Amino acid sequence: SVAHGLAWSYYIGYLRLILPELQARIRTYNQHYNNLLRGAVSQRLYILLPLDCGVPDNLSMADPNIRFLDKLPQQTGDHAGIKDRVYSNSIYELLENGQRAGTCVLEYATPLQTLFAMFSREDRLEQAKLFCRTLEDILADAPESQNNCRLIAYQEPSFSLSQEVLRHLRQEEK
Amino acid sequence: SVAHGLAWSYYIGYLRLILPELQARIRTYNQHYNNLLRGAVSQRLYILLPLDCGVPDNLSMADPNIRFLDKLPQQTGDHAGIKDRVYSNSIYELLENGQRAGTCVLEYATPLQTLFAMSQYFSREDRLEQAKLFCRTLEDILADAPESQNNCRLIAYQEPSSFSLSQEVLRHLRQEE
Numbered sequence: 001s002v003a004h005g006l007a008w009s010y011y012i013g014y015l016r017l018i019l020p021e022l023q024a025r026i027r028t029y030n031q032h033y034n035n036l037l038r039g040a041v042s043q044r045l046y047i048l049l050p051l052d053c054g055v056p057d058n059l060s061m062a063d064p065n066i067r068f069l070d071k072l073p074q075q076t077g078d079h080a081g082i083k084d085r086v087y088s089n090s091i092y093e094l095l096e097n098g099q100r101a102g103t104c105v106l107e108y109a110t111p112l113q114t115l116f117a118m119f120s121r122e123d124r125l126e127q128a129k130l131f132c133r134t135l136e137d138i139l140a141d142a143p144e145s146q147n148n149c150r151l152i153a154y155q156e157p158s159f160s161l162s163q164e165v166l167r168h169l170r171q172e173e174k
Numbered sequence: 175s176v177a178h179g180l181a182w183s184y185y186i187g188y189l190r191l192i193l194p195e196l197q198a199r200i201r202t203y204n205q206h207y208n209n210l211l212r213g214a215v216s217q218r219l220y221i222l223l224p225l226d227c228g229v230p231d232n233l234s235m236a237d238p239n240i241r242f243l244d245k246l247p248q249q250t251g252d253h254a255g256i257k258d259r260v261y262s263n264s265i266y267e268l269l270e271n272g273q274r275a276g277t278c279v280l281e282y283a284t285p286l287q288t289l290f291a292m293s294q295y296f297s298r299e300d301r302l303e304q305a306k307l308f309c310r311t312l313e314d315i316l317a318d319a320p321e322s323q324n325n326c327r328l329i330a331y332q333e334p335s336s337f338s339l340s341q342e343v344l345r346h347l348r349q350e351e
């Protein structure tokens with residue numbers, strides 16, 4: 001199936017390479033780049049998985065209570081003949097009553113865009129669920145996923161994306 | 175099937191975004207006189223598609239007659255909540271008798287690595303089937319796409335260890351000139 005392949009591709013071509021190095025890049029940002037009075041960036045990569053596969057290019061659109069702060073120090077690797085392929089990740093402030101309630105490295109699972117660009121709304125929802133299911137199995141079995149990665153799967157019906165992420169962020173400090 | 179999805183992902187998540195901008199980035203590189211003196215870069219993205227799905231991280235590794243020269247001016251775009259995702263491509267000198275015979279933007283189709291990882295230890299026959307489907311699916315997508323306008327050449331091949339990757343590329347490169 002398609003979503004089987006995209007989920008494995010997403011692990012093998014991305015998560016496998018960046019998750020081992022993520023904590024060091026977040027440590028680096030907190031200790032050097034992060035402003036004196038700004039909250040610490042949390043230690044986990046939060047991956048948004050909208051089951052409708054609607055992936056906007058900017059998260060401020062999906063919820064204005066999600067505010068882009070800064071980029072992490074970038075990671076590079078020689079891969080498939082491409083010298084210094086750049087792995088960049090963006091930091092987001094999650095706002096509650098116009099004030100920062102949390103900070104995290106936050107992004108959509110890009111391959112959901114490929115399902116969206118592809119044959120019905122119902123069949124797409126089944127592939128999106130399979131993508132999530134398949135990725136959950138890969139990361140539950142992977143040495144690189146050591147509670148440094150949280151999948152946030154959700155169906156939009158009124159909805160708060162910022163509150164959905166903040167729920168996950170609060171569960172991790174415990 | 176798997177290879178159907180990876181081929182579409184490779185177009186939608188990469189080729190669709192970079193092929194419209196590619197000629198302008200190669201034009202920019204060739205307009206710098208000191209670049210052009212070493213040799214003009216060809217106007218197409220050359221994509222290697224080994225059907226055995228063996229994708230090494232370095233092209234010098236696969237064949238030392240392929241020598242990394244420089245990176246292209248990089249392209250950026252805000253995509254899936256990642257601000258300024260960097261689209262980088264590498265320029266390579268292709269040697270014949272220790273002399274430059276060509277310069278081109280060259281890379282492996284990365285998703286072949288996912289097929290290889292899935293079946294390095296299902297089967298070597300099923301891997302060859304999926305690799306062929308990946309190539310055939312991408313061939314169809316680009317034949318029908320407005321972004322593929324003689325600015326992208328697929329190089330599918332099988333290794334027989336009496337092979338020259340540099341000569342394989344130069345054959346394709348010379349036909350496009």
Ligand SMILES: O=[P@]1(S)OC[C@H]2O[C@@H]3[C@H](F)[C@@H]2O[P@](=O)(S)OC[C@H]2O[C@H]([C@H](F)[C@@H]2O1)n1cnc2c(ncnc21)NC/C=C/CNc1ncnc2c1ncn23
Nearest residue numbers: 009010013014086087110111183184187188260261284285
């Ligand atoms: O839909 P996508 S963005 O594209 C599929 C395909 O398109 C090709 C490549 F062949 C892909 O497959 P793969 O390498 S096995 O990655 C499979 C998924 O992992 C995910 C992402 F979901 C990938 O799927 N992934 C990979 N890299 C990457 C990343 N930032 C965030 N997510 C990333 N930063 C590194 C550099 C990104 C820009 N530069 C690129 N250079 C070359 N080829 C490229 C780039 N971006 C794409 N592609």
